[PDB]
Structures are given as structure tokens and as C-alpha cells.
Design a protein around this ligand. Structure first.
Ligand SMILES: COC(=O)c1cccc([C@@H]2C[C@@H](O)N3c4cc(C)c(C)cc4N(C[C@H](O)[C@H](O)[C@H](O)COP(=O)(O)OP(=O)(O)OC[C@H]4O[C@@H](n5cnc6c(N)ncnc65)[C@H](O)[C@@H]4O)C4=NC(=O)NC(=O)[C@@]423)c1
Lengths: 666, 133
């Protein structure tokens, strides 16, 4: 999409429609005449364009109104009112831009931000951008959260996010121009290799994959057409549904072997009854011929009954020979209708031991995508965010993804090695109790108008708490926290002293021995300039490989790589790193997933702020004080960096709306 | 509206595989046994029929009679008349067979015989006698 309409698409916004959010801020415009709406919509799209074409400088209202032409620049307040809405909700002037108007000399209101993940940083940038006092408390000794980047010599490899999922409407697109991110497109080709080390043949790879995708569509049909979404009072998972689909395909292979062999009995038995008439007929013929000889032995001249006997017997044996000729003609048709069926037998099996192994690799790929065993994903909802896929190829960040947090971090008041232990929020403000990670005895107190929580969902889930809320989170929030899923995938980073793999191949598979290890070291990435292979551990494997030493793990990696390239061509790795995200106390996992029994609506619950009760009973209903951001709070873009980032922008918008007011609604 | 093609998924079959924990394995063992079952009644009738086929070796070729080619004639000789009355008694109404007994007489002449020589040869009682048998 191009022009002004491209800017609305690149901003995840319908170019020809007002959104629910814009209705809320412009209830005049949207309930008004359709002509004003097109003006507004153009003004939005035109402003978004201006920001998008150069996102390294701030877009001021003046700069904006100047480049609008009439009739659109006829109303200054409508333009001023649009530009302000955009700037507030981080659609324009977000990320890293030089300002034109330097910052307000004094700050208004104070906000504490827990965590300096991307979602933290993104709000903090914006809140500071709005003239607020922002401090981030971060438990680690580094910014970025689950954007981890290993660095040592020239070796660079991310342990966390590594893929930008396509720049078509991705906010990271804008951030990529703001920061020098080296974005290298992947190449989609992924050669599979089984446990022996032989490459899987092209015909088998294509066959299995198509069945894989056909099995996914089948589960979708079970879900939306057969309403197969509860099983014994429990939600059906995706994994269950795949079994139920595979079973019904193995059923149908047998249902149809039976029906085919049942065609051979039904015809071998027509033949049996016909050989029975033919053996009996060759006996009525054997004696009736005998009888005709005897009659013909009587020598002439004969009386006429003796002559009629020969003629009658001769006629009868001829009639009886017509019959046996017709019958050995049918007998010839059914003996061929039996060889045709014999040489046209249907498929013996649904999938062999070997095919079901290659299919397990494609299931490990789903397990990696959603960082969880398929037995936990909701059948109904696990892909509820598919409609908002970006367009374009996926990319990698070839100088390390950490370069983005670190960039966003610059200019901000960040207390590292500060672990929040208690959050207290009252009708009159908030206090956050944090401690020093290095020495727990040192204790810190932060007072503020608002706390923005971006604690990972695995942290929020932790029993007994790592962070205590005072007063406790209402049941409607804690139940969303329990219902949601927080998955796990891990990475092994192998640093070598030479490329020994296909350099024109970014990624290549390794087929598991068993279903249970389908996730154990199933995929390898060749993503970086240097010689670094990087090996995933998905599914049920992810949680178990965390109990195994680094050397036992790098051993299996070396084994696998030997089998595919031979023992001579694979050296020891110079440097090795193995992640353990579920073990990490500041993550407790990798990202979130729509658990069975959950839904995308739980993501909306995670995003609602908390409003404390009144201090003085009978006092006026207070302000909201505790706000949540992060990957698990954004319904349409969960478990991503861009979703983290967008959720920060979102909270910064509504915290600002709350504590600085919003003139753009008049 | 409809599944991917070749996928088999009706409301009846899903319930029968979910009804309990191994309700899957049961009904796919019901079918492995219903197919061993059929593949050896296959092999047993394929063997019964191999034996019936051994008895028909040689067909009926010793048992043939050559084809008599003889030009059809009009006049009824007394010998031909006598054969017909006996053919009528041994059959009755099967003009094709009678035509084949007499050999030089077509099926229309036989039917015409039935009424021309009806009195003199008392063809009436003859058929009564045949029907008793
Ligand atoms: C349906 O779609 C898909 O499934 C999907 C689609 C496309 C790509 C991807 C992938 C898969 C993978 O390949 N990659 C990835 C890999 C790993 C290993 C991991 C682990 C993650 C990813 N993420 C996710 C992304 O990493 C994160 O979702 C994002 O980073 C969230 O950030 P956050 O919400 O801000 O949260 P935080 O945890 O970062 O920060 C919070 C801060 O709180 C601090 N604190 C804790 N406790 C305290 C305390 N007590 N006090 C003070 N501070 C505390 C803590 O220290 C931390 O710093 C991926 N996303 C991608 O887009 N690309 C990828 O590449 C992908 C998946």
C-alpha cells in the first residue's frame, strides 16, 4: 500500500475508517457528517505519512499544519487536535528522534516503571517525552529483558528475541531507521536431516509438510465447524485435536482396506458359486454324452423312438454345452475383475515410522513458534492473533538485537540491580519497595503517583510471590494471570573457528528419534557474519534440557552436527552459551501463549489498570494508580518485541491522559 | 463448510474416538481384527476355488459333438413328423429345441405344424401328458 493510505497501513490503522480509539477522542467527528470524517481521516493519514517519511526528527504541529494544503489546513484546531492524539498514543514521535522544542524545564507527576524490558523502555521514553518524571527499576544488571545479546570478541548472538517478523506495518520498522540495526532477511529454505545424518529426500519432505498443513486445517475444521472444543468438561487443546485428527485418518485407512478386501470376497464368492455350477454341469455333460454314445452305438436301421433318442440326446448335449460355454465366459470376466482389484490395493498405512518422525519435526516447529507443548495450547484460540501478521520476510538483527534496548535506554533514569519486592498503591499515591540484587539487606523506597508494571507473566505467576501487591491484585486479575500460559524455549550458541555448513542456508533441521524429543536440538540457525550456529530446544524438551549440564548439551549438539557433516569437519566450539529462561528468576519462562481454557480476552484483562479503594470512606472514587505493560498485555501482538513495545506506548498514552489530562477531546 | 479433501471427519466418528481414554485404540483394534478376519476367508475361498478349478481341467472338449450343417427343407416326411410328436412329448412348446431335434425344420414350420397336423397327430392330448411330468 502507498501514499497516505500506506501510512495508515504502516500504522496498523484502517485508512478509510475511524477506529474505536479515535471515536473515543473525537465523538463529535464520528457522530457527525461523513464529510468531516474524510477530512479527519486524511489529516490523520497525512500526519502519519509526514512522521513515517522521516522518523529521525520530531514532527511538530507547526511542521505538520504547514505541509497540509487546503481545504484540510482550514481548521487549525482539528489539525492541532489530530496531531496531539497521534503524539499521545505513540503513533508519531516515538522511539529515538531529536526534538526541536527542548524538554519542559520542570516535570509533572511522578511514575515508577518496573522492569526495563522493551515495554518498560518504550513507555519510559514516552513519559519523559511528555514532561513526566520517570524512573525504571530493573532487577538485572542490563537493560532489555528477554532481548538478551551475547557478546564476546566478534561473536554476537542473541539469546532472546532474534527475529523481526516483517516490516509491513511493524513499529520496529520505524525503530530500525532510528537505530543502526543491520537487518538481514532470512532465506526460507530449511533442509531436514534425520538422526542417521542423511538428508531427507525432497519427495518425502514435501509429502509430510503438506500433510502437516492439512492436519492443521483439519483441527481448525474440528474447532469452528464441529464445535469440538470441550472434552470431559475440559477445554480441548491443539495437541489433543491433532491426535483425534491423526486417529481418524488411520481409522479411514483401515475402513477402506476393509471395504476393498470385502470387494474381493464378494467376487471370489460369485466365482465359487459359478465354479459349482460348472463342476455340476461338466457332470450332467459327462453322463449325457455317455448316454448319447450308447444310443448312437445301436446300429441302423433304427425304429423312430430309437432314432429320436439319439437326436434328443444330441440336442440336449448341445444345449448343455452352450450353457457351460456361457459360464466359462462369465468365469473369465470374474477371474480378471479379481486380478484388477488385487493389483490396485489402497495405501497400507497412514504414515510410517519414518514419516511420523518427520511430521514430529513440523510439530516441534509449532512447539517453537508458541514456546510450549501443543498439549497446552487452546485449540479454539491459539492462533487468535493471525489476522495481524505483518507483511514481508522475517529478518534477523545481525549486530545483536540488544542494540535496540540500549538505544532506547539512553537519556533515562534507570536503577539497575534493583529488584522490586513489594508494590503498595493507595488512593493518594504509590510506594515501591526494592532491594539490591547483589546485597539483599540494602532496601529502597520509591514514592510516586503511578506504578507501571512490566513484570514478565512468569514472574507475576510465581508461587510464592516474588513481588507482593499491597493490597493484593483483585481476583479478576489474578485469575487472568493463572489462566494464561507462559511458555519456554531455549537456545544453544555454538561459536566455531570455521564455517563448515552451507553458507547460503540460514537454517536447517534435525529430525528427532522419538516424539518425546522432537524439540531437543531440532533446528539450527546460520544468522551472523561470524561462524555461529545457534540451536533451538522447543516443546517438552525445553523444560528438561534445563536440568542438564552445558557440556552434556554441547555434546549432543556436536554429535548431531557430526552426523550431518562428518566427524572430521566439525571442530570443538571456541565459545558456548546455553540459555535457561525458565530458570531465570526475572523471566520464569520465555514468552506467553494462549493456554487451553484461556483466550485473547485474558490479554485484555492483563492490560486493565488497578484503582485502589478510597482512603477515607465516603471519599470520591479515586484515580487509577497501577498500570501493566509488556508482551502479555497486548491482545493482537503477544509474545513479540513489537508487542512489548506497542504496549509500552499504550500505557504511556493512558497514564499521560490520566495525570496530565487531554485537551484533544474537546 | 467442508474439511480439506481426503481428511475424514464426521460428527459420528469424532465422538466414537473421544468417548473414553483408549476408545481410540479400541476401535482401531476392532478394525485390525476385522481385517485379519477377512484376509484369510479370502485365502480360504481362494483355496476352495483352486480345488473346484482343478476338477474342470480339460473343460468339456472330449465331450463335444461336431456341428451338423444341413440345408432346411419344406416337406414334412413321415419320419420327421414322428420325431416331432416325440419331441413335443419330451418338451412341449420349446420350438427351438424341437427345431434342433428335427434338424432340417425351422421354428416357424414347427409352430405351423402345431395346427396343421393338430387333429391327425392329436397334439392336444400330447401336451396334456407332458404337463403331468
Ligand atoms: C505468536 O508470536 C510468537 O510467538 C513469536 C513470533 C515471532 C517471533 C517470536 C520469537 C521467538 C524467538 O525468536 N524470540 C524470543 C526468543 C526467546 C528465547 C525469548 C525468551 C523471547 C523471544 N521473543 C519474545 C520477546 O523477547 C519478548 O516478548 C519481549 O522482550 C517482552 O518484553 P517485555 O514485555 O518488555 O519484558 P521483559 O521480560 O523483556 O522485560 C521485563 C523486565 O522486568 C525485569 N524484572 C523482572 N522481575 C523484576 C523485579 N522483581 N524487579 C524489577 N525488574 C524485574 C526483567 O529483568 C526484565 O528486564 C521473541 N519475540 C520476537 O519478537 N522475536 C523473537 O525472535 C522471539 C515469537
Amino acid at each position: 500500500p502507498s501514499g497516505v493510505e500506506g501510512a495508515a497501513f504502516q500504522s496498523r490503522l484502517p485508512h478509510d475508517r475511524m477506529t474505536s480509539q479515535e471515536a473515543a477522542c473525537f465523538p463529535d467527528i464520528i457522530s457527525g457528517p461523513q464529510q468531516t470524517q474524510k477530512v479527519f481521516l486524511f489529516i490523520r493519514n497525512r500526519t502519519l505519512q509526514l512522521w513515517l517519511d522521516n522518523p529521525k526528527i520530531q514532527l511538530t504541529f507547526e511542521a505538520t499544519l504547514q505541509q497540509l494544503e487546503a481545504p484540510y489546513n482550514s481548521d487549525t484546531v482539528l489539525v492541532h487536535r489530530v496531531h496531539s492524539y497521534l503524539e499521545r498514543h505513540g503513533l508519531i514521535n516515538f522511539g529515538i528522534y531529536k526534538r526541536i522544542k527542548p524538554l519542559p524545564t520542570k516535570k509533572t507527576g511522578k511514575v515508577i516503571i518496573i522492569g526495563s524490558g522493551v515495554s518498560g523502555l518504550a513507555a519510559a521514553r514516552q513519559l519523559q517525552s511528555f514532561g513526566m518524571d520517570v524512573t525504571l527499576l530493573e532487577a538485572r544488571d542490563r537493560v532489555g529483558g528477554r532481548v538478551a545479546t551475547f557478546r564476546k570478541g566478534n561473536y554476537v548472538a542473541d539469546l532472546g528475541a532474534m527475529v523481526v517478523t516483517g516490516l509491513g506495518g511493524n513499529p520496529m520498522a520505524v525503530v530500525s531507521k532510528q537505530v543502526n540495526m543491520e537487518l538481514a532477511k532470512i532465506k526460507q529454505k530449511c533442509p531436514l536431516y534425520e538422526a542417521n545424518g542423511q538428508a531427507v529426500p525432497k519427495e518425502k519432505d514435501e509429502m509430510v509438510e503438506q500433510e502437516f498443513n492439512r492436519l492443521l486445517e483439519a483441527t481448525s475444521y474440528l474447532s469452528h465447524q464441529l464445535d469440538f472444543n470441550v472434552l470431559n468438561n475440559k477445554p480441548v487443546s491443539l495437541g489433543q485435536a491433532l491426535e483425534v485428527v491423526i486417529q481418524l485418518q488411520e481409522k479411514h485407512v483401515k475402513d477402506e482396506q476393509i471395504e476393498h478386501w470385502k470387494k474381493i470376497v464378494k467376487t471370489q464368492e460369485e466365482l465359487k458359486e459359478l465354479l459349482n455350477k460348472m463342476v455340476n454341469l461338466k457332470e450332467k455333460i459327462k453322463e449325457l454324452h455317455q448316454q448319447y454314445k450308447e444310443a448312437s452305438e445301436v446300429k441302423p436301421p433304427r425304429d423312430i423312438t430309437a432314432e429320436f433318442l439319439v437326436k434328443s440326446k444330441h440336442r440336449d448335449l448341445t444345449a448343455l454345452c452352450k450353457e457351460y460355454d456361457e459360464l466359462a465366459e462369465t468365469q473369465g470376466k470374474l477371474e480378471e475383475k479379481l486380478q484388477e482389484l488385487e493389483a490396485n490395493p489402497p495405501s497400507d498405512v497412514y504414515l510410517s515410522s519414518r514419516d511420523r518422525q518427520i511430521l514430529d519435526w513440523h510439530f516441534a516447529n509449532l512447539e517453537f513458534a508458541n514456546a510450549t507443548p501443543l498439549s497446552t495450547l487452546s485449540l479454539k484460540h491459539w492462533d487468535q492473533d493471525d489476522d495481524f501478521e505483518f507483511t514481508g520476510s522475517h529478518l534477523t538483527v545481525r549486530n545483536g538485537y540488544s542494540c535496540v534496548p540500549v538505544a532506547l535506554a539512553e537519556g533515562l533514569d534507570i536503577k539497575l540491580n534493583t529488584a522490586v519486592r513489594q508494590v503498595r498503591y493507595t488512593a493518594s499515591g504509590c510506594e515501591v519497595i526494592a532491594v539490591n540484587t547483589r546485597s539483599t539487606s540494602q532496601t529502597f523506597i520509591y514514592k510516586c503517583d503511578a506504578v507501571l508494571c512490566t513484570l514478565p507473566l512468569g514472574v507475576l505467576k510465581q508461587q510464592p510471590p516474588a513481588v507482593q501487591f499491597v493490597p493484593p491484585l483483585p481476583e479478576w486479575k489474578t485469575s487472568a494471570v493463572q489462566r494464561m500460559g507462559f511458555g519456554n524455549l531455549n537456545k544453544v550458541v555454538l561459536c566455531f573457528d570455521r564455517v563448515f555448513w552451507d553458507p547460503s542456508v540460514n537454517l536447517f533441521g534435525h529430525v528427532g528419534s522419538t516424539t518425546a524429543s522432537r524439540g531437543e536440538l531440532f533446528l539450527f540457525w546460520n544468522l551472523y557474519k561470524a561462524p555461529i550456529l545457534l540451536a533451538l530446544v522447543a516443546g517438552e524438551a525445553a523444560g528438561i534440557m534445563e536440568n542438564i549440564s552445558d557440556d552434556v548439551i554441547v555434546g549432543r549438539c556436536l554429535a548431531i552436527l557430526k552426523g550431518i557433516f562428518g566427524s572430521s569437519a566439525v571442530p570443538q566450539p571456541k565459545e558456548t552459551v546455553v540459555s535457561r529462561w525458565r530458570a531465570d528468576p526475572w523471566a520464569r519462562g520465555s514468552y506467553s501463549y494462549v493456554a487451553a481454557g484461556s483466550s485473547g480476552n485474558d490479554y485484555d484483562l492483563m492490560a486493565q489498570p488497578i484503582t485502589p479503594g478510597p482512603s477515607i470512606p465516603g471519599a470520591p472514587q479515586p484515580i487509577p494508580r497501577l498500570f501493566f505493560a509488556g508482551e502479555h498485555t497486548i491482545r493482537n501482538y503477544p509474545a513479540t518485541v513489537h508487542g512489548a513495545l506497542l504496549s509500552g506506548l499504550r500505557e504511556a498514552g493512558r497514564i499521560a491522559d490520566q495525570f496530565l489530562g487531554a485537551m484533544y477531546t474537546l | 463448510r467442508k474439511p480439506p479433501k481426503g481428511m475424514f471427519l464426521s460428527q459420528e466418528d469424532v465422538e466414537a474416538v473421544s468417548a473414553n481414554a483408549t476408545a481410540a485404540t479400541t476401535v482401531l483394534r476392532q478394525l485390525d481384527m476385522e481385517l485379519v478376519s477377512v484376509k484369510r476367508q479370502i485365502q480360504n475361498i481362494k483355496q476352495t476355488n483352486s480345488a473346484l478349478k482343478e476338477k474342470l481341467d480339460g473343460g468339456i472338449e472330449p465331450y463335444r459333438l461336431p456341428e451338423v450343417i444341413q440345408k432346411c427343407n419344406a416337406r414334412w416326411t413321415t419320419e420327421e413328423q414322428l420325431l416331432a410328436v416325440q419331441a413335443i412329448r419330451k418338451y412341449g412348446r420349446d420350438f427351438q429345441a424341437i427345431s434342433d431335434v428335427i434338424g432340417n425344420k425351422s421354428v416357424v414350420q414347427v409352430k405351423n405344424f402345431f395346427v396343421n397336423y393338430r387333429r391327425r397327430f392329436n397334439i392336444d392330448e400330447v401336451l396334456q401328458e407332458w404337463e403331468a411330468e
